[PDB]
Design a protein around this nucleic acid. Structure first.
Lengths: 66, 77, 80, 122, 83
RNA sequence: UCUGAGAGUUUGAUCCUGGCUCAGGAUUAACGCUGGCGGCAUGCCUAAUACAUGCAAGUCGAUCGAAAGUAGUAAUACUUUAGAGGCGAACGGGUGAGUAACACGUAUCCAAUCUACCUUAUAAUGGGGGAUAACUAGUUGAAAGACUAGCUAAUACCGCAUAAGAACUUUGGUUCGAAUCAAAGUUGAAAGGACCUGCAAGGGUUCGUUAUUUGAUGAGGGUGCGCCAUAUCAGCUAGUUGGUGGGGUAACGGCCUACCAAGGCAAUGACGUGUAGCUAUGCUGAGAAGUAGAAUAGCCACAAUGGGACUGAGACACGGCCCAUACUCCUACGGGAGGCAGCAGUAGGGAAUUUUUCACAAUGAGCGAAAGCUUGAUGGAGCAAUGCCGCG
RNA sequence: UGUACCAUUUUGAAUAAGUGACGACUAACUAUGUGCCAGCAGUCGCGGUAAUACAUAGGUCGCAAGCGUUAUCCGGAUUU
């Protein structure tokens, strides 16, 4: 089974207007690559690029992505 | 979602195909009797009616009614 | 059963398996309180055999309650 | 060709019956409609049970044309009537259920929302 | 047809149709709240069985049976003929 | 007999006709001020508005082949079932949107219909054939799935034989639209499992199955009677009314159809409109009756709407199918899941209607010879002084 | 559910009351403020100068872990 050393937690340490959200999106996409459910072309280029910061910054903020 | 629902659906698809087949076998011999009103055709029709009634495809009352209608025509001959 | 909570009172009835719980019943056998350790069912044992011979077998929980009274001892021999 | 003050039917969930053109969006004095051209429209008949009201001017796009235009393939599809679909302030259309088929002459131009609600695309 | 007694005696009003008659039974009863003799009139449609035919202005006996036709669920049992 | 209460209010003052308010019980009550408990019931009448998620019908290996794995040299023992097939699914669960008439309440007639399993005993469970999932391979494929060819068993399917008994027809007889019975013509039933015994042969216990045959039971159909307001609603009705022939649902029936027709209902008020679940029942008074038809018990129907068919014994089927319709969600944009008036719970409404609760302990249900599996039916617990009793 | 319940188990008045109303109808009143202003209220009807009709204090009366309050139904209303 899963041992206690196998649940690693990472935090994206930065402030906004630094491309931080885009790096988080890329990490979540490539790390959350799911091919059979439909995530492929729905999160391939998920864009939080700033035209209106608030919308993306609210819809994507959460507690933790696994 | 009900597993028994889809199970019985896939079962009664085949059951419906078989029932339609037997119903058409019945009706084509009923037409044959309508063409040739004789004893042999009536005997075949009643044999097939009993076959359906054996499994239960046609209720005994319906079979009795239809065979009464056919035997009346044969008796008129 | 029916009655107030913390007071189980199950009236003994003949049941056909198609009927809902404590709905329109065919015929009430009698009354019995499971809490009291004493036989208290009001049964005639004649109409009971009538229902047995006309089918629609009642609850199984009372079958034992009829073995104590010897209903089986006469029912199985009246079957012959 | 379809033109201004041409009342045609609607092909989505609006509750309207007829709707007329008032002006073709774009450069002035174009005066000639074509497939996929966005236009300004005014409803002609509408029931309150829908989601439109009489006398209101909105924006739509013609999808099916009685005139017919020839596609770059060289195969020319036509329709026996004119059909228009209303769009709410952007590429997203107001309606959810589309009635009748559509064409592919606007696939390269976007409008994937409309085709996502269409049964057949030519 | 021999079913038990069911008396529906009345006065036949019309016999325009072939072996079909509109009979009229006039029943007097008591008010459920005041108990006074109050009369009411009910129409019935009856079929003649061949062996018995209905003539206007006579007392008859009507019984229930299998429906011969729509709204025809009764038959003529006994006829008190013209008087 | 159950069982009976009045006062004030007009006037300068008096009486009389009449009205109004108060004096009391009850809630599917709530608000406002406070607030201990035990016992017990009750806790969306509004949006049958839309509603995320878990449950709300599952079960059967003593039905079958096969598949996988723990032991075992393999064989085989051991654990499960993906599928087929079987039973169950139509009942429970919930609401009153809609329904003004046999729907409801009640008695008959069904010589007008059926009922798997339960109850009645009897003939039998004879011999063959063919496929088929499961499995593999190929294709369409992101999966979802779908298409194509082989592989496999059955209490699955399909011929034939026996068919006392049954259906059908004919001859005779009983009786007042049908009864019982003698002979004849015709027709059609299946399958073995599991266990024990026996060298075998064969025999036995139970189950599964067909036929026949008794009740009980459910449903359906007709019936008299009563069962809202409304005349500031006088004509309504065209398979309608009726007949002949035929077809058709369990049956009779224009139920439907071919033909012939002209009536039928109807000032004892039809038709029209509004409203409506009904009944037993809850309250009020002694009663005439009114009030409300919480829960409950039965009956009635739909399950977002309009329709249709199938399986099944029974459904046009709470969470079956398909079609059309309004929406959500996913989609790689090709197409798909569909529908909590089930338990909950939330957005909103309102005065307000609750744990996103436990176990099926008990009953029941569904199934299986069984160990028994499921059960938000069912029984407990939680919140709230909504109400009653007791209690500090 | 170690629940209910029981046994001088231990300490302990200690751990728990508010509510409406008093002119009459209909048992339950006096003081201060008050000037048709405030306000009461189911009715008669109260308050523009000693207000038992109002606001408050006290007293008093009636209910009670409930009291009032409205909606609504039967009685009184035999007032279809």
């Amino acid at each position: 089974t899963v041992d206690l050393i196998n649940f690693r937690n990472f935090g994206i340490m930065a402030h906004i207007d630094a491309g931080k959200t885009t790096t988080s999106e890329r990490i979540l996409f490539h790390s959350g690559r799911i091919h059979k459910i439909g995530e492929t072309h729905d999160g391939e280029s998920v864009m939080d690029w700033m035209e209106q910061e608030k919308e993306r910054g609210i819809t994507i903020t959460s507690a933790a992505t696994s | 979602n009900i597993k028994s629902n889809e199970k019985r659906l896939r079962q009664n698809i085949k059951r419906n195909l078989n029932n339609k087949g037997q119903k058409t076998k019945l009706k084509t011999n009923v037409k044959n009797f309508h063409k040739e009103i004789n004893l042999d055709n009536l005997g075949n029709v009643y044999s097939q009616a009993d076959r359906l009634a054996r499994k239960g495809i046609i209720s005994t009352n319906r079979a009795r009614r239809l065979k009464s209608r056919n035997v009346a025509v044969l008796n008129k001959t | 059963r029916m009655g107030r909570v913390h007071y189980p009172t199950y009236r003994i009835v003949a049941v056909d398996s198609r009927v809902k719980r404590d709905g329109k019943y065919i015929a009430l056998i009698g009354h019995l309180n499971p809490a009291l350790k004493e036989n208290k069912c009001k049964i005639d044992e004649a109409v009971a055999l009538e229902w047995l011979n006309k089918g629609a077998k009642p609850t199984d929980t009372v079958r034992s309650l009829f073995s104590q009274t010897g209903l089986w001892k006469k029912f199985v021999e009246s079957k012959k | 060709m379809v033109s201004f003050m041409t009342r045609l039917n609607v092909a989505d969930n609006t509750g309207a019956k007829q709707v007329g053109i008032i002006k073709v969006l774009g450069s002035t004095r174009k005066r000639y409609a074509f497939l996929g051209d966005v236009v300004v429209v005014s409803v002609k008949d509408a029931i309150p049970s829908g989601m439109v009201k009489k006398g209101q001017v909105l924006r739509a796009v013609i999808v099916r044309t009685k005139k017919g235009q020839q596609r770059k393939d060289g195969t020319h599809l036509k329709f026996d009537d004119n059909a228009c679909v209303l769009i709410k302030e952007d590429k997203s259309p107001r309606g959810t259920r589309i009635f009748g088929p559509v064409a592919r002459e606007l696939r390269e131009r976007g409008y994937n929302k409309i085709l996502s609600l269409a049964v057949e695309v030519v | 047809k021999r079913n038990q007694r069911k008396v529906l005696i009345g006065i036949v009003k019309s016999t325009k149709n072939a072996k079909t008659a509109t009979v009229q039974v006039e029943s007097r009863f008591k008010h459920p709240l005041y108990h006074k003799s109050v009369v009411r009139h009910k129409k019935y449609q009856a079929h003649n069985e061949g062996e018995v035919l209905a003539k206007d202005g006579d007392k008859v006996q009507i019984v229930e049976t299998r429906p011969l036709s729509a709204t025809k669920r009764f038959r003529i049992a006994k006829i008190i003929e013209r008087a």
